[PDB]
Design an enzyme around this catalytic site. Sequence first.
Site, PDB file in Angstrom:
ATOM      1  N   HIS B  42       0.811  -1.240   0.000  1.00  0.00           N
ATOM      2  CA  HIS B  42       0.000   0.000   0.000  1.00  0.00           C
ATOM      3  C   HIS B  42       0.832   1.273   0.000  1.00  0.00           C
ATOM      4  O   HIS B  42       0.426   2.306  -0.569  1.00  0.00           O
ATOM      5  CB  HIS B  42      -1.073  -0.007   1.104  1.00  0.00           C
ATOM      6  N   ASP B  88      -0.779  -7.272   1.817  1.00  0.00           N
ATOM      7  CA  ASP B  88      -0.139  -5.959   1.897  1.00  0.00           C
ATOM      8  C   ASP B  88       1.392  -6.176   2.069  1.00  0.00           C
ATOM      9  O   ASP B  88       1.911  -6.144   3.192  1.00  0.00           O
ATOM     10  CB  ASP B  88      -0.728  -5.111   3.036  1.00  0.00           C
ATOM     11  N   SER B 185       3.608   2.633   8.755  1.00  0.00           N
ATOM     12  CA  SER B 185       3.190   1.776   7.637  1.00  0.00           C
ATOM     13  C   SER B 185       4.356   1.256   6.796  1.00  0.00           C
ATOM     14  O   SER B 185       5.210   2.012   6.374  1.00  0.00           O
ATOM     15  CB  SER B 185       2.231   2.578   6.730  1.00  0.00           C
ATOM     16  N   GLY B 186       4.382  -0.047   6.569  1.00  0.00           N
ATOM     17  CA  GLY B 186       5.456  -0.654   5.794  1.00  0.00           C
ATOM     18  C   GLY B 186       6.640  -1.078   6.641  1.00  0.00           C
ATOM     19  O   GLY B 186       7.509  -1.824   6.169  1.00  0.00           O
TER      20      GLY B 186
HETATM   21  C1  LIG Z   1      -9.270  -2.157   4.908  1.00  0.00           C
HETATM   22  N1  LIG Z   1      -8.890  -0.797   5.339  1.00  0.00           N
HETATM   23  C2  LIG Z   1      -7.426  -0.543   5.071  1.00  0.00           C
HETATM   24  C3  LIG Z   1      -6.972   0.891   5.461  1.00  0.00           C
HETATM   25  C4  LIG Z   1      -7.694   1.493   6.687  1.00  0.00           C
HETATM   26  N2  LIG Z   1      -7.326   2.671   7.264  1.00  0.00           N
HETATM   27  C5  LIG Z   1      -8.166   2.918   8.273  1.00  0.00           C
HETATM   28  C6  LIG Z   1      -8.017   4.098   9.169  1.00  0.00           C
HETATM   29  O1  LIG Z   1      -8.807   4.308  10.085  1.00  0.00           O
HETATM   30  N3  LIG Z   1      -6.940   4.839   8.933  1.00  0.00           N
HETATM   31  C7  LIG Z   1      -6.427   5.876   9.808  1.00  0.00           C
HETATM   32  C8  LIG Z   1      -7.228   6.974  10.198  1.00  0.00           C
HETATM   33  C9  LIG Z   1      -6.694   7.930  11.052  1.00  0.00           C
HETATM   34  C10 LIG Z   1      -5.388   7.831  11.516  1.00  0.00           C
HETATM   35  C11 LIG Z   1      -4.608   6.733  11.156  1.00  0.00           C
HETATM   36  C12 LIG Z   1      -5.120   5.760  10.300  1.00  0.00           C
HETATM   37  C13 LIG Z   1      -4.208   4.578   9.909  1.00  0.00           C
HETATM   38  N4  LIG Z   1      -3.546   3.993  11.074  1.00  0.00           N
HETATM   39  C14 LIG Z   1      -2.495   3.177  10.831  1.00  0.00           C
HETATM   40  O2  LIG Z   1      -1.928   3.124   9.734  1.00  0.00           O
HETATM   41  C15 LIG Z   1      -2.128   2.158  11.886  1.00  0.00           C
HETATM   42  C16 LIG Z   1      -2.543   1.971  13.167  1.00  0.00           C
HETATM   43  C17 LIG Z   1      -1.917   0.845  13.723  1.00  0.00           C
HETATM   44  C18 LIG Z   1      -1.079   0.239  12.824  1.00  0.00           C
HETATM   45 CL1  LIG Z   1      -0.214  -1.254  13.183  1.00  0.00          CL
HETATM   46  S1  LIG Z   1      -1.000   1.007  11.321  1.00  0.00           S
HETATM   47  S2  LIG Z   1      -9.406   1.784   8.593  1.00  0.00           S
HETATM   48  C19 LIG Z   1      -8.804   0.906   7.242  1.00  0.00           C
HETATM   49  C20 LIG Z   1      -9.389  -0.423   6.726  1.00  0.00           C
END
Ligand SMILES: CN1CCc2nc(C(=O)Nc3ccccc3CNC(=O)c3ccc(Cl)s3)sc2C1
Lengths: 54, 233
Positions: B42, B88, B185-186
Site C-alpha cells: 500500500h 499488503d 506503515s510498511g
Molecule cells: C481495509 N482498510 C485498510 C486501510 C484502513 N485505514 C483505516 C483508518 O482508520 N486509517 C487511519 C485513520 C486515522 C489515523 C490513522 C489511520 C491509519 N492507522 C495506521 O496506519 C495504523 C494503526 C496501527 C497500525 Cl499497526 S498502522 S481503517 C482501514 C481499513
Amino acid sequence: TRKLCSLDNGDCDQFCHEEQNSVVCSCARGYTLADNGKACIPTGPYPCGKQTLE
Amino acid sequence: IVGGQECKDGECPWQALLINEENEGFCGGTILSEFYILTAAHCLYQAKRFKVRVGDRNTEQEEGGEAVHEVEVVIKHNRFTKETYDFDIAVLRLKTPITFRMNVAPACLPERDWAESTLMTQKTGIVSGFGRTHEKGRQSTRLKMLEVPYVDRNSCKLSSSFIITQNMFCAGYDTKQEDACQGDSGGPHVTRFKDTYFVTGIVSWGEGCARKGKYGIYTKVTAFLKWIDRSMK
Ligand SMILES: CN1CCc2nc(C(=O)Nc3ccccc3CNC(=O)c3ccc(Cl)s3)sc2C1
Ligand SMILES: [Ca+2]
Ligand SMILES: [Ca+2]
C-alpha cells in the site's frame, strides 16, 4: 506435556524441528550451527537480527 | 508510534525509511539483506517516485551514519487489494548494496513453522518507525519503537470493523494508549528470541491509532516467506 521442541525450544538457539522423535536445531542465514548442534555462531560481520554495538 | 520509546543508538538497525521527492518519510521498511527491503504494498501508492534511507534516527540532524539508496526493482504482491489491504507486501531491490554499520543491519527471516509455533506465540513483538505520535499528529522526527502484545485471533476479528484475513494478525493494546500509527506503515514488526530479532510482521493499517477496543493490524510475514525468498531470488 511439553516435549522436544515444545520444551524450551529443544535447547536450540534458533530454529527447532522434530525429526523421527528427536530435536534438530538449525540457524538463520549468516549463522553456522555450532559443534554442539544447538548454538548458532555468526559467520561474518553484522549477522542478521543483532542490535549494533560497533 | 504512539507511546513507546526512542530507538537508542544501535537498537533498531533494520529500520528503513521510504522518502519521497521532498526528502520526507512517508513509510517504513525492514532491511532484509544488503540489496533488499521489505515494505507494505500500500505504501507504493503514497509517492510516485521514492528512495530508501537507512541508518537514520533523527530526521532533523546528520549523524553521519545515514545513507540513501535508490530502488532498482519494485516487487509488489500481485494479489494486493486496496479494499481490504489483503496481501499488503512488497519487496524492493536496491540499485546499490547497503553498508552495514552502526544502526544499519538486517533482521533475520525465520522459518515458517518455527516462527508460527515459537515466535508468534511469544507475549510480545516490537514495532518501530517515524510515524505519527498521535492519531491526528505530524510524523515523528525521531525513530521510535514500542513493545506490542500479540493479540488473540478471535479477539481481533471481534474488534474489527473490517475483515481480518489470514494474511494479517493483530498486536497492541485494547485500551492502553500505545500503538503504531500512520507513517509507521510498511515498517518492521520483529520478535526477539534469545537476543536475535526476527521479522514477523509489516505495519499495515489500523482504525485510527491507539483507539479503545482497536488493535494494530500487521501483514503476517510467515504467510509470505516462500514469496519473499522467491522475490530475493
Ligand atoms: C481495509 N482498510 C485498510 C486501510 C484502513 N485505514 C483505516 C483508518 O482508520 N486509517 C487511519 C485513520 C486515522 C489515523 C490513522 C489511520 C491509519 N492507522 C495506521 O496506519 C495504523 C494503526 C496501527 C497500525 Cl499497526 S498502522 S481503517 C482501514 C481499513
Ligand atoms: Ca539524521
Ligand atoms: Ca487499542
